[PDB]
């Protein structure tokens, strides 16, 4: 579809408490003498 004209929503969302949002773990020569 064309859909000419789309409104935007700019707000202060997204609050992360210094932790993974979901429970599931978010974790994922040499000096010498010649």
């Amino acid at each position: 579809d064309e859909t000419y004209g789309v409104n935007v929503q700019f707000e202060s969302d997204e609050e992360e408490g210094d932790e993974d949002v979901y429970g599931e773990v978010r974790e994922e020569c040499t000096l010498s003498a010649n």
């Binding site: 859909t3 409104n7 935007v8 929503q9 700019f10 000096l31 003498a33 010649n34």
Partner: protein, 167 residues
């Protein structure tokens, strides 16, 4: 005559440095990065434009994606904004999120095939054919990302079996 206090200190420091360098000349693998080369090759990767304008464009693309998750023009704009500035992995993730949020979209599927490598673009074309079959653009993207003769022949045979009315 007069006393040059710093003279003896400078002489001793020079002698010590010379002795150490003589000792340091016996080192095995001490590395050295030439400042001439590094400075000359520093501008070998120099330029996206304004950082504030790119940040405002990314914020507008995020607001359009939050206001319309099922808009493959908004997903394509977010993927283009993430690919033109930053890394391509975030652009591939945004294209995958737009393809998962807006199914049966050929433009979002083409953006996901262009933003991801070919090993992921083949799976993206397979997911696009499973979500929206009889697509000539998805079939052309699957046949072009085959890099083989027999694989492209099988892709053309599958496209002729799916949509035989494509010239």
């Amino acid at each position: 005559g007069e006393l040059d206090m710093r003279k003896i200190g400078q002489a001793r420091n020079t002698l010590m440095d010379m002795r150490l360098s003589q000792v340091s000349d016996s080192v095995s693998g001490q590395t050295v990065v030439d400042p001439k080369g590094y400075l000359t090759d520093l501008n070998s990767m120099i330029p996206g434009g304004d950082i504030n304008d790119i940040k405002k464009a990314r914020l507008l693309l995020k607001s359009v994606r939050e206001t319309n998750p099922h808009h493959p023009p908004a997903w394509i704009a977010s993927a283009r904004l993430e690919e033109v500035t930053g890394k391509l992995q975030v652009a591939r993730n945004l294209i995958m999120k737009g393809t998962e949020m807006c199914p049966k979209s050929e433009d979002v599927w083409l953006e996901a095939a262009r933003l991801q490598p070919g090993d992921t673009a083949k799976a993206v074309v397979a997911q696009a054919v499973r979500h929206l079959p009889q697509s000539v653009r998805i079939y052309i993207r699957a046949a072009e990302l085959e890099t083989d003769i027999r694989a492209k022949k099988r892709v053309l045979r599958k496209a002729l079996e799916h949509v035989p009315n494509s010239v």
